[PDB]
Design a protein around this motif. Structure first.
Motif, PDB file in Angstrom:
ATOM      1  N   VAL A   1      44.260  39.141  46.980  1.00  0.00           N
ATOM      2  CA  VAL A   1      44.465  39.814  45.704  1.00  0.00           C
ATOM      3  C   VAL A   1      45.460  40.959  45.844  1.00  0.00           C
ATOM      4  O   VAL A   1      46.225  41.234  44.913  1.00  0.00           O
ATOM      5  CB  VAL A   1      43.123  40.269  45.109  1.00  0.00           C
ATOM      6  CG1 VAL A   1      43.350  41.063  43.839  1.00  0.00           C
ATOM      7  CG2 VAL A   1      42.248  39.073  44.822  1.00  0.00           C
ATOM      8  N   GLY A   2      45.487  41.626  46.990  1.00  0.00           N
ATOM      9  CA  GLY A   2      46.376  42.740  47.208  1.00  0.00           C
ATOM     10  C   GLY A   2      45.735  44.102  47.075  1.00  0.00           C
ATOM     11  O   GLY A   2      46.431  45.066  46.732  1.00  0.00           O
ATOM     12  N   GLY A   3      44.447  44.221  47.350  1.00  0.00           N
ATOM     13  CA  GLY A   3      43.805  45.514  47.401  1.00  0.00           C
ATOM     14  C   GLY A   3      42.305  45.377  47.261  1.00  0.00           C
ATOM     15  O   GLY A   3      41.737  44.287  47.364  1.00  0.00           O
ATOM     16  N   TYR A   4      41.677  46.517  47.054  1.00  0.00           N
ATOM     17  CA  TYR A   4      40.240  46.560  46.853  1.00  0.00           C
ATOM     18  C   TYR A   4      39.848  45.969  45.510  1.00  0.00           C
ATOM     19  O   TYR A   4      40.427  46.299  44.462  1.00  0.00           O
ATOM     20  CB  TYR A   4      39.735  48.000  46.947  1.00  0.00           C
ATOM     21  CG  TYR A   4      39.593  48.483  48.367  1.00  0.00           C
ATOM     22  CD1 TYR A   4      40.652  49.089  49.020  1.00  0.00           C
ATOM     23  CD2 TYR A   4      38.402  48.336  49.059  1.00  0.00           C
ATOM     24  CE1 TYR A   4      40.530  49.534  50.317  1.00  0.00           C
ATOM     25  CE2 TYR A   4      38.272  48.778  50.363  1.00  0.00           C
ATOM     26  CZ  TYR A   4      39.337  49.379  50.987  1.00  0.00           C
ATOM     27  OH  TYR A   4      39.219  49.829  52.288  1.00  0.00           O
ATOM     28  N   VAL A   5      38.830  45.125  45.566  1.00  0.00           N
ATOM     29  CA  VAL A   5      38.181  44.527  44.411  1.00  0.00           C
ATOM     30  C   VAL A   5      36.694  44.810  44.511  1.00  0.00           C
ATOM     31  O   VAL A   5      36.168  45.134  45.576  1.00  0.00           O
ATOM     32  CB  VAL A   5      38.442  43.009  44.327  1.00  0.00           C
ATOM     33  CG1 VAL A   5      39.934  42.731  44.135  1.00  0.00           C
ATOM     34  CG2 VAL A   5      37.915  42.305  45.558  1.00  0.00           C
ATOM     35  N   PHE A   6      36.016  44.707  43.382  1.00  0.00           N
ATOM     36  CA  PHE A   6      34.595  45.017  43.344  1.00  0.00           C
ATOM     37  C   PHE A   6      33.928  44.170  42.267  1.00  0.00           C
ATOM     38  O   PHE A   6      34.596  43.669  41.354  1.00  0.00           O
ATOM     39  CB  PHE A   6      34.369  46.514  43.086  1.00  0.00           C
ATOM     40  CG  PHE A   6      34.805  46.960  41.717  1.00  0.00           C
ATOM     41  CD1 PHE A   6      36.120  47.338  41.463  1.00  0.00           C
ATOM     42  CD2 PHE A   6      33.901  46.983  40.675  1.00  0.00           C
ATOM     43  CE1 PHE A   6      36.515  47.709  40.204  1.00  0.00           C
ATOM     44  CE2 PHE A   6      34.290  47.365  39.415  1.00  0.00           C
ATOM     45  CZ  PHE A   6      35.596  47.727  39.180  1.00  0.00           C
ATOM     46  N   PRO A   7      32.611  43.978  42.349  1.00  0.00           N
ATOM     47  CA  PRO A   7      31.933  43.182  41.322  1.00  0.00           C
ATOM     48  C   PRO A   7      32.012  43.859  39.965  1.00  0.00           C
ATOM     49  O   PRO A   7      31.692  45.043  39.818  1.00  0.00           O
ATOM     50  CB  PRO A   7      30.487  43.120  41.820  1.00  0.00           C
ATOM     51  CG  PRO A   7      30.538  43.469  43.267  1.00  0.00           C
ATOM     52  CD  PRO A   7      31.694  44.403  43.422  1.00  0.00           C
ATOM     53  N   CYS A   8      32.394  43.090  38.952  1.00  0.00           N
ATOM     54  CA  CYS A   8      32.509  43.693  37.633  1.00  0.00           C
ATOM     55  C   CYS A   8      31.185  44.257  37.124  1.00  0.00           C
ATOM     56  O   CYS A   8      31.197  45.116  36.234  1.00  0.00           O
ATOM     57  CB  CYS A   8      33.115  42.708  36.640  1.00  0.00           C
ATOM     58  SG  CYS A   8      34.849  42.201  36.976  1.00  0.00           S
ATOM     59  N   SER A   9      30.054  43.800  37.670  1.00  0.00           N
ATOM     60  CA  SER A   9      28.747  44.333  37.309  1.00  0.00           C
ATOM     61  C   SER A   9      28.455  45.700  37.918  1.00  0.00           C
ATOM     62  O   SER A   9      27.424  46.296  37.583  1.00  0.00           O
ATOM     63  CB  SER A   9      27.653  43.342  37.723  1.00  0.00           C
ATOM     64  OG  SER A   9      27.668  43.110  39.127  1.00  0.00           O
TER      65      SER A   9
END
Length: 330
Positions: free
Chosen positions: A248-256
């Motif tokens: 993705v190209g960086g930090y992602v997190f659960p939308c919840s």
């Protein structure tokens, strides 16, 4: 003199902000991205390659009675995100929020990269970094602020960006009703041409403040907050399920997830970025993975206090002989 103009997010994520600017006589109003991280005022124009214009409003110098070709002048810029544009140069009258500069260099695009073409809401950029970064050759040109400075009541401009809402750019005065508490001023280095300053540290959520010097730039033209990998790791470690995704190209997190706030220091003062400012929504439509608004600067070479940080504050860009930055809560 003074000027005051409303700046409006281009989309529901606050990816960028546009401000109306009057160019030429009669006025041609274009919606520009005010960028304290660059120093060129450039516009989509009647000269832009037709296939590279897709819905933008264009400046047509031949329809302005005050436009004059700046003979021999060309420009070419590449931005930190890999986008670029280039062209030739006119001088013309430019007004922002009632503040008028005559003889402003208006850089007319002959070519723009695909990211500009694909964003129909941004008709160009208005750079507000130091004029030493201006790309016009062979004679470097001054920014709108540099040209206006001597006429202004005070040699300052302020950025008051909204969260999911319009905000304001003011020139020449500090609206004391626009912030709470006091403004804390901090030293600026102009050695790289940016509004470069040193934050005194950070906190994650309700955690203890870590005193540490973080050199970075105040950049209204960058969406996110880019900080050292150690700081960013400490932030995302407080979000269950967050991870750095190479794909993705960086930090992602659960939308919840509910995100914690992030505090940065300005001298002894503290600016708090609410957690919801750090949510940039699904990585793709319908995804339950959301993109983070705090990202590592490790691959950039500089830390960037972009819109995520700046919109949590009322920010004074003090262009006195020795420039300084001011931050207040609001």
């Amino acid at each position: 003199s003074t000027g005051s103009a409303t700046t409006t997010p281009i989309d529901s994520l606050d990816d960028a902000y546009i401000t109306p600017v009057q160019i030429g006589t009669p006025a041609q109003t274009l919606n520009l991205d005010f960028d304290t991280g660059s120093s060129d005022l450039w516009v989509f124009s009647s000269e832009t390659t037709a296939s590279e214009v897709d819905g933008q409003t264009i400046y047509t110098p031949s329809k302005s009675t005050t436009a004059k070709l700046l003979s021999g002048a060309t420009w070419s810029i590449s931005y930190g995100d890999g986008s670029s544009s280039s062209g030739d140069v006119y001088t013309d009258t430019v007004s922002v929020g009632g503040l008028t500069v005559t003889g402003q260099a208006v850089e007319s695009a002959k070519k723009v990269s695909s990211s500009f073409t694909e964003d129909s809401t941004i008709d160009g950029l208005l750079g507000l970094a130091f004029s030493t970064l201006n790309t016009v050759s062979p004679t470097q040109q001054k920014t709108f602020f540099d040209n206006a400075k001597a006429s202004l009541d005070s040699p300052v401009f302020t950025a008051d960006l909204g969260y999911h809402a319009p905000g304001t750019y003011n020139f020449g005065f500090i609206d004391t009703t626009a912030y709470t508490g006091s403004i804390t001023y901090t030293a600026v280095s102009t050695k790289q041409g940016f509004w470069e300053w040193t934050s005194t540290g950070y906190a994650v959520g309700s955690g203890t403040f870590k005193s540490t010097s973080i050199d970075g730039i105040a950049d209204t033209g960058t969406t996110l907050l880019y900080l050292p990998a150690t700081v960013v790791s400490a932030y995302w470690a407080q979000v269950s399920g967050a991870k750095s995704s190479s794909s993705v190209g960086g930090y992602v997190f659960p939308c919840s997830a509910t995100l914690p706030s992030f505090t940065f220091g300005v001298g002894s003062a503290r600016i708090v970025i609410p957690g919801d400012y750090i949510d940039f929504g699904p990585i793709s439509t319908g995804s339950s993975s959301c993109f983070g608004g705090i990202q590592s600067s490790a691959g950039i070479g500089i830390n960037i206090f972009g819109d995520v940080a700046l919109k949590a504050a009322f920010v004074v860009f003090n262009g006195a002989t020795t420039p300084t930055l001011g931050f207040a809560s609001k």
